[PDB]
């Protein structure tokens, strides 16, 4: 019978969660109390980029820590120069509804995705000066949300059909497919060694999947609401998730339960994007309250308000050397911060 | 320093191209199509012309309108509905040929109730404020054929039908029998009373009686967008 098997499964999950709760002895807050204060900073805008028309939905830095790409609701993507505020390239899209953007680690390819359920891959460096469409990837019955690059020929894409899958350029079909989420996933972060990854869904759960293993590796009980953005700690043994419940969390890979929670009484809106720094000492986040709230990775307290935008902020990201923090909002105004 | 000068020149060329794109982009209005599989939404879009979402364009009196037909993902519009916040209007299509005898396969009551619930969900959305819907009542020939064909009465599962009579504001354009005029205005008043429960004077609904093989829908959308923009302009300057 189905009922008996389901009930043994529920006792199995009950004893699993009992073991998980028994595998914890002391919180890190007491250990955190052994550290010195960090200091509050009023870092100001250095440069401002204003080229788009509609809202800005995604952005991605480069491997040189000075080039970046961003995607707008208008249907075009332009590559900025973070130093001299120059528009290196401009590419018009075929679909006007895109909500993700990526930049190749080798600085040769870009990726796009949206409600069209198609993943576009362009070729920045060609024989001709203009940029031409290289490959179109289809096969997802869901709107794309993340299109992070795994290598020069491997792309991992997140879609709204509750399934994530690894792809390939030359063959043009997905190699491996990962399933297990009930709701639609819209978050994805990679690892420094490009061997594992984590994803989040609206079902209030975070799932860690190994690329080589081929199926689910870890499952974490998330927040009380959806997951809007996720990020991976630079060390490689922890990560952080942001939700609409006006609070953020961070977990670790090895121990498999919650480590830290960030929340405040004043903040009520939902988190839109989350990022770390080079040393992982302070955590950056974006809210609907038009300000990019700066947090502390250890004390779990605020550092500075750091405002400057008029509308909802949707994306931000630090460079590979921690030199600047780009930030995109819904008013089509990029803001280089330092 | 010639490299920087050439980079600046390329930036100026890109800026000129972006200025041209902005000039082209500001003269178009975007509409959001919405409906159900049973309704002739495909028929409506096909008559309106003359794998992700579909896009179509049309020109009316030198005004360009972009219409986004929605053939899209799983039936949950909680996250992909946020991108539609600057659209001019929402065109909702409802099939008016679902009698109480055709209830459903295994899910709920008659499809009219499901359409009413869908319309209520669209109306009471949070991100969909300041947007006015253009309600449509499609598939009217079948209703007129079925009201007098027997073997199906909507009063069986709609007890409030016997208490309803045609209003004096009705227009006797069918010229056939007041039963069709009674049913038409019954369903129209039902949709209105579902609609006019909130809004606070920021958006309105415009019911219409149209057929799948109709031709004057173009003028209807033009006239409804005109008033929608005109009222907003009047309200912005404290003139309304």
């Amino acid at each position, epitope marked *: 019978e189905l009922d008996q098997l389901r009930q043994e499964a529920e006792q199995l999950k009950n004893q699993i969660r009992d073991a998980r709760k028994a595998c914890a002895d002391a919180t890190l807050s007491q250990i955190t109390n052994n550290i010195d204060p960090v200091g509050r900073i009023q870092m100001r805008t250095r440069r401002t980029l204003r080229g788009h028309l509609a809202k800005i939905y995604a952005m991605h830095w480069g491997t*040189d820590s*000075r*080039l970046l790409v961003s995607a707008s609701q208008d249907g075009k993507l332009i590559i900025w*120069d973070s130093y001299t505020t*120059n528009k*290196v*390239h401009a590419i018009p899209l075929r679909s006007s509804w895109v909500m993700t953007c990526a930049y190749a680690p080798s*600085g040769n390819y870009v990726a796009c995705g949206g409600l069209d359920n198609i993943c576009s891959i362009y070729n920045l460096k060609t*024989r*001709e*000066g*203009n940029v031409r469409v290289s490959r179109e990837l289809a096969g997802h019955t869901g709107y794309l949300s993340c299109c992070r690059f795994l290598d020069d020929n491997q792309i991992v894409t997140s879609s709204g059909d509750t399934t994530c899958a690894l792809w390939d350029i030359e063959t043009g079909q997905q190699t491996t497919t990962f399933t297990g989420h009930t709701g639609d996933v819209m978050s994805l972060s990679l690892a420094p060694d490009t061997r594992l990854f984590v994803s989040g869904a609206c079902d209030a759960s975070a799932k860690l999947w190994d690329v080589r293993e081929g199926m689910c590796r870890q499952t974490f009980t998330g927040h009380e609401s959806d997951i809007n953005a996720i990020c991976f700690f630079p060390n490689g043994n922890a990560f952080a998730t942001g939700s609409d419940d006006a609070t953020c969390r961070l977990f670790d890979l090895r121990a498999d339960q919650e480590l830290m929670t960030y929340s405040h009484d004043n903040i009520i809106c939902g988190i839109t994007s989350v990022s770390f720094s080079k040393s992982g000492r302070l955590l950056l986040a974006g809210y609907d309250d038009f300000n990019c709230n700066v947090w502390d990775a250890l004390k779990a307290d605020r550092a500075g308000v750091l405002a400057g935008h008029d509308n909802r902020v949707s994306c931000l990201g630090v460079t590979d050397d921690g030199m600047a923090v780009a930030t995109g909002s819904w008013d089509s105004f990029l803001k280089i911060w330092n | *320093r*010639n*490299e*920087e*000068k*050439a*980079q600046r*020149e*390329a930036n*100026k*060329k890109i800026e000129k191209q972006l200025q041209k794109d902005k000039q082209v982009y500001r003269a178009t209005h975007r509409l959001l199509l919405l409906g159900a599989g049973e309704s002739g939404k495909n028929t409506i879009v096909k008559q309106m012309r003359i794998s992700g979402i579909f896009e179509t364009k049309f020109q009316v009196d030198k005004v360009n309108f972009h219409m986004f037909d929605v053939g899209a993902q799983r039936d949950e519009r909680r996250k992909w509905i946020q991108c539609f916040n600057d659209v001019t209007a929402i065109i909702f299509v409802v099939a008016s040929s679902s009698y109480n005898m055709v209830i459903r396969e295994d899910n709920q009551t008659n499809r009219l109730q499901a359409a009413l619930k869908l319309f209520d969900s669209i109306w009471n959305n949070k991100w969909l404020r300041d947007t006015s819907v253009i309600l449509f009542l499609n598939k009217q020939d079948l209703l007129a054929e079925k009201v007098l064909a027997g073997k199906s009465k909507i009063e069986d599962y709609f007890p409030e039908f016997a208490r309803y009579t045609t209003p004096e504001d009705a227009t006797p354009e069918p010229g056939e029998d007041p039963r069709v005029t009674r049913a038409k205005y019954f369903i129209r008043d039902e949709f209105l009373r579902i609609s006019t429960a909130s809004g606070d004077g920021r958006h309105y609904c415009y019911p219409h009686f149209t057929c799948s093989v109709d031709t004057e829908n173009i003028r209807r959308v033009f006239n409804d967008c005109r008033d929608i923009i005109q009222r907003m302009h009047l309200r912005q300057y404290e003139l309304l």
Partner: single-chain antibody
Amino acid sequence: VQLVESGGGLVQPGGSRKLSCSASGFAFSSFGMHWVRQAPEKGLEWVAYISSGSGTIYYADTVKGRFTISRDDPKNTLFLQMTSLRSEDTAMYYCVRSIYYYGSSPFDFWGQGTTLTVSDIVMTQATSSVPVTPGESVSISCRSSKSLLHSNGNTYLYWFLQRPGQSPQLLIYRMSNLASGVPDRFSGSGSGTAFTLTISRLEAEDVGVYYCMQHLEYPLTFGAGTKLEL
């Protein structure tokens, strides 16, 4: 990528001539253009420069009143008019394309060229003929009268290594970046006023003439040139 050059020859002094360069196989509307001259017994020398959208038009410092340039994108033609010619301008003419952004490679592809026969920063090569063997190291020197470094940090220096019989190629640009189609057998280094080009392995394709050109100021002057004989 194809460049076809037409015009040139021998005409009486004082007349007017017409040169044309057509680009087929790529979109040149976003490529800056250069016309460069090479004397029969001397090295390369720049003549004229056209911006991407004709916003900037630059003429030779040695002579500019007798040169005029223009281009048409729909017809895909860059053409030159010369009036009242002298015996000085007796050099091969080349039309070259170059695009300028961050991380770009200026002066990538060169044309076949056409023959017509009738101070600023100075760079000279100490040597003129270096006899070597296929398997030893080859060193070529370059000296500049002024420090080529800029405030940004870019060392504007370019080598060509033109083969004796075909169009010049690009090997090392900005003194520290290698080209695409050049085999990994060349290297370059410098300090600001003394620069060197080093070759480890030699084959039959390394015979040619090497050039040293700078882009700090704008005389677009070139080096001397060294011929290799085996």
